[PDB]
Design a binder for this molecule. Sequence first.
Ligand SMILES: [Fe+3]
Ligand SMILES: [Fe+3]
Ligand SMILES: [Fe+3]
Ligand SMILES: [Fe+3]
Lengths: 307, 307, 307, 307
Amino acid sequence: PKPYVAINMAELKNEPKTFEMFASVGPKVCMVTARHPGFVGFQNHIQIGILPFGNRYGGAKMDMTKESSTVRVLQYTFWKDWKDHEEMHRQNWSYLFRLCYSCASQMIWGPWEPIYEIIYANMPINTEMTDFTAVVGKKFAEGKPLDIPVISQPYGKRVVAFAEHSVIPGKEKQFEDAIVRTLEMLKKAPGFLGAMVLKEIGVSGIGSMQFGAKGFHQVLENPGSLEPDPNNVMYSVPEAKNTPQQYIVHVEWANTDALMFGMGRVLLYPELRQVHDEVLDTLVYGPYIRILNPMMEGTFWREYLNE
Amino acid sequence: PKPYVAINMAELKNEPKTFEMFASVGPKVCMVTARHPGFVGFQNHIQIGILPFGNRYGGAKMDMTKESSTVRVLQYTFWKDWKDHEEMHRQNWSYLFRLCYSCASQMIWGPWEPIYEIIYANMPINTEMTDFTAVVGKKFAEGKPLDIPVISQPYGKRVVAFAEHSVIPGKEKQFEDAIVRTLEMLKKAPGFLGAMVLKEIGVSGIGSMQFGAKGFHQVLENPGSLEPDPNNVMYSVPEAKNTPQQYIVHVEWANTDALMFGMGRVLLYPELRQVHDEVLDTLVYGPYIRILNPMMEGTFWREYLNE
Amino acid sequence: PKPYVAINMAELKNEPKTFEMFASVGPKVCMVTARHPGFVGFQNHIQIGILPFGNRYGGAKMDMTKESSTVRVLQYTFWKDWKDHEEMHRQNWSYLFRLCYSCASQMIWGPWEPIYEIIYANMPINTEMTDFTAVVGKKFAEGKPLDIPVISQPYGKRVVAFAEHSVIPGKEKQFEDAIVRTLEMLKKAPGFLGAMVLKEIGVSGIGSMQFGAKGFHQVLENPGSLEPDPNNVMYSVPEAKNTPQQYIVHVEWANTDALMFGMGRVLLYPELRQVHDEVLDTLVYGPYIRILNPMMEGTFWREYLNE
Amino acid sequence: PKPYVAINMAELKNEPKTFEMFASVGPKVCMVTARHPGFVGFQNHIQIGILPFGNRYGGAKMDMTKESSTVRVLQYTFWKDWKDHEEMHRQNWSYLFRLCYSCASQMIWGPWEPIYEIIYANMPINTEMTDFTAVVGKKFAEGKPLDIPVISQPYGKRVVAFAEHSVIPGKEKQFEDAIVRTLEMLKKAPGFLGAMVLKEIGVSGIGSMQFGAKGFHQVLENPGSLEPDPNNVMYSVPEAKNTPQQYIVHVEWANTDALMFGMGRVLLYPELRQVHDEVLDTLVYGPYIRILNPMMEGTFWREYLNE
Ligand SMILES: [Fe+3]
Ligand SMILES: [Fe+3]
Ligand SMILES: [Fe+3]
Ligand SMILES: [Fe+3]
């Protein structure tokens, strides 16, 4: 079934010390998260660049890692129910706060952790190139060769287009209907590895280190080993839901060229351009497209999705 | 009287060609904006860094200009009525679009142009160090020594704390009352040069290059000398107003140390800390504090303000 | 069905500034071209080299990119009807001229845009290496395993043999019959990815910036933002059709070794050599064989082709 | 059927002279070992690193080869009956001792040669990427598509997780049952190439150069061309079996990322974590996980295994 998604977002200094702490503390945070039975997996991304849209963002390119002074992370965790995320943070707060607080020396912005519902998903399980023979064998044995997926390789061996959209109030249904029609056509582009549409339902104050006064002072004054009062979060998840309504259109691709020309199909192929124009008419903001590398992940999230 | 404020925000590559285009294009844009009789002035900022709050943003410093790969600009224009902003943009679209388009080669994000009402202002006129003798003489000559301002030096000779806040729905009045009480106390800190509170009322689609499908394709396809259809903006300014409600607390300071310890007064001086705690209890997001240099400005906006 | 093909040809300086403008302006031109509902896609090439044919062109090699002072581009656009190409240019001339004129600073020769009919096509859809599993599954589910194509990878991951031929007047049928027999045999060569035969039907004067006197002056005097009169083209497409008749034999290959030995099959395999000798007897000029890299492309042209 | 496994373990200087000895001596030893009809194959490994378990072994990483002063080898030989290994050594002692002695100059620790029974195996035959087309063909031809294996590439083109465990006396059955459940679930991880559990039954004194006094003096005094008395081994294989009982859990993976996150599935996927917790409760020692590269091998051992 469709899980809910929490996306923890932050911007950190682009230096070895940051990647060192990703490698030490990141696994620990994931192990802590996995203590909760409602956790169904994760997909952790680094932003490598920004899609330039010709020269609309002429200062950007799809891979800016060499030049950029910062690194943005977008850490997706998947949950049977979004309340499971809120419970896990609170049940495991002494570990999680002290783990996440160790990233402080490297932080420039964040953490900020919006929560989403998945309103559309066309996403395969991941497979390594070594796996495909057995997958094909099994699908033919089951008499379902139509269910043989594309090869979507895990652990940094594909790329993601993370397309931000905010929608005019009243135009949500028009956006949702048109984006799904768009993505159903998009899937014909070479190197398409799957797509999903995330609709924001709110924000996790605790995941965002956003407390009332007491907890704010506790964060600022922390030696690193003392939890802020987790009951000093002043707002529930839905209270922070944005209007204009926010969506992420998340599309996965074999490589950055497939991403550039494949996402470009919505502009270059007249039939699809006409459908996608119905999306564009509904927007307050976007599409703004970040190029992400899914590096560290728990691929069983897709197994849950496709149950 | 209080003007409305439009703040055009963008992120560009941090390199010489960018600052060269600020020098070419920026003055031209301001001159075009001044064709409208409702224009009352401008204050254009570059972000120099981010307030670290001890080590909460431990990768940040107040001056990050030597290491950052990007530069963020925040261009304030002041208007008798916010509709004047919208009218100026449409009436001068040929010039403005083609001027702003020249910046595309350097752009990474933006433009994004929220519009604000000023709900509180304690801001002086600017004066150079050479002016103060005549100001003092003139105020004493008219029997108004209370109207002698601090010396708030124009053109890059002071610094701004730009503090972003978003507020729990329903707590807008509590925030507003609390922040004004806070700023009325803050004005005792040494080096304090004034403060104002901006409350978002909406977003200029045209200023943000956010059109429907027709205008989006015109933007992406543009050789630089053809206008997108300015009538293809699909939402009004208020239709884009965010909930949670967004505010900017804008506080000016003599220098960055005065800024750090001055804004710090709300954490360090117990009586003020108690008042400011009432602000903190209302927030969804923030305070996140950008450090800005007001470089290019039309100082007469303050003359209008203080009329 | 078989579309028509326009091939825009030019030679430019082989320097970064040329490739910078390909990345900036190329996409804009494609987006403009896609405004016409008769546009069915595109395949844009850079010439990497020339086939030496032993040492017949002993100064050449298949990859000359490191040494060459120029770069030749051959931009294929595909059209339901060739008249569509002519309408598209006229209907969108404001944008298109101004975009293409921005290439001026780098141009040495061109543009020159002959138009072709396809008289023979054996060309597959493109697929990425990730896609093949699903393609195989679908064709078996459909009971059409015979229709499983080779893997012809998009976006610079294969090579093209572009073989120019001109034919003795009166021998066009003999050429056409012999070249098809030849290509039907050539498809056995390892790494063969498809072939088509293009027969020239004329030249687009507008696409070649070839006007009467009035438009010629307008081109030469242009500051960059003023279109020449698109109605000052003095000849229709068919009026410029060459005699001797020109053809392109376009053959795609997995890599340059497969290209060299595979194309060489017409010389090395006696049974094929006998068939291809019938082609050679009909020529005025050729075969002259350029080695091309298909970098930017709209792969959906093959979908139209194969319906 | 399941063979028995002898694992010869040694630590040598990490310098070129060592790898030169591997290249000349190693193939000779394997040829001698092949003189016995009970020899069913071999798989020889170098340790490339150690799994850090987050930062539990924070000084380790998966590939330590550039920094390490030593190199550990783990040479697996597979035997129809374990007694065959013992007989082979005695029958071929003049050659083997003299061959193994020539490694002396490079040795820091070892040799040490425990013998194992295989209590669980899910291991495929190895195939090169060239082979898979024919394997698929044959399996479909015999109506067994379910038996198409993953592609497990020989000769250094995959990696091995070598997980050491020692088990509380009396908890052997619990460990064995829970480890099998764990590996049956682990096989769903991307990149999984097979697993087996080895249970120690004893140690080969002769393979370990572990003699009584007579043979010890002979080894120490050896010019290189005189055998120690092979009848001076003082203990049988089972007499050296350890309590606490030792096991190796040997898991093969496409690459080190698949190994890291895949082995990690036992910590990150809640359903598998619960199962693996049952293994963890049984341990005296471990899991301690060496990362191995299987470079030189006699792949036919898996053919024997899978008959
Ligand atoms: Fe979270
Ligand atoms: Fe504006
Ligand atoms: Fe053309
Ligand atoms: Fe042995």
